[PDB]
């Protein structure tokens, strides 16, 4: 994350981050319940093997680790366009809900559309760089970004944004998701109840003028990811 | 504004419209409270919770 504020303690409790086999963080995901992580499709090609840590805010100071079952990629997930970025990992054994360690809500299709898309921010969050070129970071961040206007975005995207995307962020203000940001938490908040709405996917850059981020748009797959856990 | 258009319907979370009038819902691990409006944690830790 560039810019935004550092997750204080039980902000950001959904927050899980992928593993490498050297303990580092490549990718974010969102815990969905005991066993279940959402993130990227993508994301799981960008190591051989990976573990992931939760509940975990200082990549320093010790936190949970678990080893993945079962990883349920989208068939449809292309390189190419990014389109269909989505999968859910199965866990070994089941996550220990705590403090900091907690699930985000799914929400209902239509509900989810009306009401939490129209809002005017959320929030995502991550351990991934704080500026475009520099190193992962190693406290866990968050940033209220608003809602792009789907209008505005494909205007502004160099690329297609697909109906399974959508674009949140700021045109100028250098505040933005980031490397190592990915397959991490978009969550948008309603009377203090905190919804899964995205999944940080991909941006020309960070932060950039006149880009904005793009994420998977959840709504979309709601119905894969319930057949995913079930 | 109308039913779910007018403060989702009083409803704390998931609110719809059935034959014209308001029926609110939970997330799961929530129950759906009397006043068949606001939802109840069932246990620790409920989903989108801050743990403060
Ligand atoms: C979808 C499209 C596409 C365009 C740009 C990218 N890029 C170019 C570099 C960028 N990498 S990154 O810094 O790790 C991601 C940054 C993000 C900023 C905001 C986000 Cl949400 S995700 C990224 O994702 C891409 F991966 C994919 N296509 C060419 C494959």
Same mark, same amino acid.
């Not at chain 1, 100071?61 to 970025?85: L, S």
């Not at chain 1, 939490?116 to 992962?136: A, C, D, P, Y």
């Not at chain 1, 940080?200 to 709504?219: D, F, H, L, M, Q």
């Given at each position: 994350?560039?810019?935004?504020?550092?997750?204080?303690?039980?902000?950001?409790?959904?927050?899980?981050?992928?593993?490498?086999?050297?303990?580092?963080?490549?990718?974010?995901?969102?815990?969905?319940?005991?066993?279940?992580?959402?993130?990227?499709?993508?994301?799981?090609?960008?190591?051989?093997?990976?573990?992931?840590?939760?509940?975990?805010?200082?990549?320093?100071?010790?936190?949970?680790?678990?080893?993945?079952?079962?990883?349920?990629?989208?068939?449809?997930?292309?390189?190419?366009?990014?389109?269909?970025?989505?999968?859910?990992?199965?866990?070994?054994?089941?996550?220990?809900?705590?403090?900091?360690?907690?699930?985000?809500?799914?929400?209902?299709?239509?509900?989810?559309?009306?009401?939490?898309?129209?809002?005017?921010?959320?929030? !995502?969050?991550?351990?991934?760089?704080?500026?475009?070129?520099?190193?992962?970071?190693?406290?866990?961040?968050?940033?209220?970004?608003?809602?792009?206007?789907?209008?505005?975005?494909?205007?502004?995207?160099?690329?297609?944004?697909?109906?399974?995307?959508?674009?949140?962020?700021?045109?100028?203000?250098?505040?933005?998701?980031?490397?190592?940001?990915?397959?991490?938490?978009?969550?948008?908040?309603?009377?203090?109840?905190?919804? !899964?709405?995205?999944?940080?996917?991909?941006?020309?850059?960070?932060?950039?003028?006149?880009?904005?981020?793009?994420?998977?748009?959840?709504?979309?797959?709601?119905?894969?990811?319930?057949?995913?856990?079930? | 504004?109308?039913?779910?258009?007018?403060?989702?319907?009083?409803?704390?979370?998931?609110?719809?419209?059935?034959?014209?009038?308001?029926?609110?819902?939970?997330?799961?691990?929530?129950?759906?409270?009397?006043?068949?409006?606001?939802?109840?944690?069932?246990?620790?830790?409920?989903?989108?919770?801050?743990?403060?």
């Amino acid at each position: 994350i560039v810019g935004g504020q550092e997750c204080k303690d039980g902000e950001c409790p959904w927050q899980a981050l992928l593993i490498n086999e050297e303990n580092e963080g490549f990718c974010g995901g969102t815990i969905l319940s005991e066993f279940y992580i959402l993130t990227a499709a993508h994301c799981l090609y960008q190591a051989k093997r990976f573990k992931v840590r939760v509940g975990d805010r200082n990549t320093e100071q010790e936190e949970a680790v678990h080893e993945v079952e079962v990883v349920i990629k989208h068939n449809r997930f292309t390189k190419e366009t990014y389109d269909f970025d989505i999968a859910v990992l199965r866990l070994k054994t089941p996550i220990t809900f705590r403090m900091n360690v907690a699930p985000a809500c799914l929400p209902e299709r239509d509900w989810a559309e009306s009401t939490l898309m129209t809002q005017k921010t959320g929030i !995502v969050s991550g351990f991934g760089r704080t500026h475009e070129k520099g190193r992962q970071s190693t406290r866990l961040k968050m940033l209220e970004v608003p809602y792009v206007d789907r209008n505005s975005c494909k205007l502004s995207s160099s690329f297609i944004i697909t109906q399974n995307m959508f674009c949140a962020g700021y045109d100028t203000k250098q505040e933005d998701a980031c490397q190592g940001d990915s397959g991490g938490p978009h969550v948008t908040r309603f009377k203090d109840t905190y919804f !899964v709405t995205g999944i940080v996917s991909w941006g020309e850059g960070c932060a950039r003028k006149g880009k904005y981020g793009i994420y998977t748009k959840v709504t979309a797959f709601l119905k894969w990811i319930d057949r995913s856990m079930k | 504004r109308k039913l779910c258009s007018l403060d989702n319907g009083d409803c704390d979370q998931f609110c719809h419209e059935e034959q014209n009038s308001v029926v609110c819902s939970c997330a799961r691990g929530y129950t759906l409270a009397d006043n068949g409006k606001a939802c109840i944690p069932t246990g620790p830790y409920p989903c989108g919770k801050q743990t403060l």
